[PDB]
Structure formats: structure tokens, C-alpha cells
Amino acid sequence: NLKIVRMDRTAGCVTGGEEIYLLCDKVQKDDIIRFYEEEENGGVWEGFGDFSPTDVHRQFGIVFKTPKYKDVNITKPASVFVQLRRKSDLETSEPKPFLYYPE
Amino acid sequence: NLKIVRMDRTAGCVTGGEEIYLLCDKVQKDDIQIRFYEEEGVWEGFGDFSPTDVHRQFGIVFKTPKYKDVNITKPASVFVQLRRKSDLETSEPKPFLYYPE
């Protein structure tokens, strides 16, 4: 169902606000980007891509800005995951890798 | 009919070979081209991509062509248009900046 096909960037500054173009299989502009890192003995950090319905290009693309990472003071890169997700039923795509690098 | 809606980069090195994501209205993967051009005589360069880089008829991921002169000292502004191979129809242009190496 949900699939990320490709992204123009797979790395970003921990400060977020960087624009990325994502090409996906069919989505609905008002019912659709979850950055997440599975944390060590249970928890899960998440941040969401920033964009509006008009940024969803013809159901097959999304232009958005990255969320800020959980810790903007890291000195070494942090490898996290990115996935599509639907608001209506919280179903998701298989995750893609994303690399947060220090400021 | 043809329309460039947006591109993730509107500038690049004269050397070419830089990847760009272009979002467009409906195209046919086997009947589409991306033409960079400059009136002089007319210089043209074509986005480098395969039919499989045309994403669901609504986007094209490609690599920029090398500009005509790699030794420019100041940026050269050109146009980019989508163009159908069959009937040569084109979109409205967008500006694109080639900067010095």
C-alpha cells in the first residue's frame, strides 16, 4: 500500500527545516512523514516532516522540511528512519534510512 | 498541456551531472524530454534520465547537462522546458542558473 520510492536527500542537519522532495506511491494529501529512532530498552523518538496538503504533488510526491532531531548538540551522526504514515488508520510504509549530522 | 510545477534545484555547476527532482503535470515516460536552452544560433542541453526515472507520470529525476562553456567567470542564466518528442510541444520555461566551476 504505502511506499517511499525515492528521496532527493537522505541526510540533513539536526536543526531541521531542510526541504526534501519525496516520491511515493499513491497518497491522499490530507491523510498522510514520520522520522523515528527506536531507543534502546523500549522508547521511540519521533518527529514529523513539515508540509501542507498543497505540497503533495498529484498524489505521488511530497515536498516537505525535515523536523529537528531530538538532540541538536550531538557531535557525531545519528542514523534514524523515515516512513510514510496515514492519519486515518496509522498504517505505514517500510522505513527508509536518514542520516542526521551535527550542526 | 506540459507544465514544470517545481524543481528541487534551480541552479547547478557548468560541469553538469547534478541530480534534480522535477515535479510536473502528466507526462509519458517514452515521450518526454527536459531541455535546457540558450539563444545565441541556439545552445541546448538535455536532462540525462531513463524512462524508469519518470515517476508515475508526475515527476522526473535526472542529471543536468554540461553547459556550453565550462570556463565562465560569472553565472549564466538559461531556460529549462519540458518537451514532447512526438509533436515537439513544450511547457512554459523556467529559469535555471549555471554557476562557475
UniProtKB/Swiss-Prot annotation, chain B:
<feature type="cross-link" description="Glycyl lysine isopeptide (Lys-Gly) (interchain with G-Cter in SUMO2)">
    <location>
        <position position="74"/>
    </location>
</feature>
<comment type="function">
    <text>Constitutes the active form, which associates with RELA/p65 to form the NF-kappa-B p65-p50 complex to form a transcription factor. Together with RELA/p65, binds to the kappa-B consensus sequence 5'-GGRNNYYCC-3', located in the enhancer region of genes involved in immune response and acute phase reactions.</text>
</comment>
<protein>
    <recommendedName>
        <fullName>Nuclear factor NF-kappa-B p50 subunit</fullName>
    </recommendedName>
</protein>
<feature type="modified residue" description="Phosphoserine; by PKA">
    <location>
        <position position="86"/>
    </location>
</feature>
